[PDB]
Structure 1
Amino acid sequence: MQIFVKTLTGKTITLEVESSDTIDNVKSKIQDKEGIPPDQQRLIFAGKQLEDGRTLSDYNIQKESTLHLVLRLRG
C-alpha cells in the first residue's frame, strides 16, 4: 500500500509500505527518505503516537492514510 506523512514544516512524504510492516520499518523508511533517527521521529495517527514494536495494522492504518511527523520545540 501507499501512505502519506505530513510534517510540521508542511512537507508531504509518500511511503510504499505493506499492511503488516512494523512501526520500526516505517521509521527506517522515513529515515532513508529524510535522515532522522527513529528514536527522534514522532509519528501520530488518529490521536495515537506510533510506538515501536507495533505494526501498521495494530493501529488500523489503511491505504492513503495520513500520519503526522512532529517534534518538540524548546523556544
Structure 2
Amino acid sequence: MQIFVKTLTGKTITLEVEPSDTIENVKAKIQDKEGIPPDQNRLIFAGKQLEDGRTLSDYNIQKESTLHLVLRLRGG
C-alpha cells in the first residue's frame, strides 16, 4: 500500500502507508522526504480536509491515492 502527495512546490511524493495508518504518521513521513514543518501545512484528499486522530480507512483512502498539501495565510 503506497500513496502519493502533491506539495505546494508542485513536487510529487511516494510513501508506504497502511489502511490503519493515522494522519499524524502519514504527515510525519512527508517531512522525511521534503522540508515541511507542522506549520503552514495540512493534508487534504479529494477536497476532504484531514487531521490527526483518524486513519486512512476512516477517511476512506485506498492504495495509490494522490493527496494535496495546503495552508492559510492572512499576511499575504
TM range (shorter): 0.7 to 0.9
Alignment of 1:1-75 (within 5 A): 1-74=1-74, 75=76
Shift in Å at residue 48 of structure 1?
A: 1.0
More helix by share: 1
TM, length-normalised to structure 1: 0.86
Separation in 2 of the partners of 1:48 and 1:6?
15
What percentage of residue pairs aligned between the two structures are identical? 95
Separation in 1 of the partners of 2:61 and 2:8?
20
Computed over aligned residues only, the root mean square deviation of the Cα atoms, in angstroms, reads 1.5
TM, length-normalised to structure 2: 0.85
Shift in Å at residue 32 of structure 1?
A: 1.3
Separation in 2 of the partners of 1:56 and 1:28?
14
Shift in Å at residue 19 of structure 1?
A: 1.1
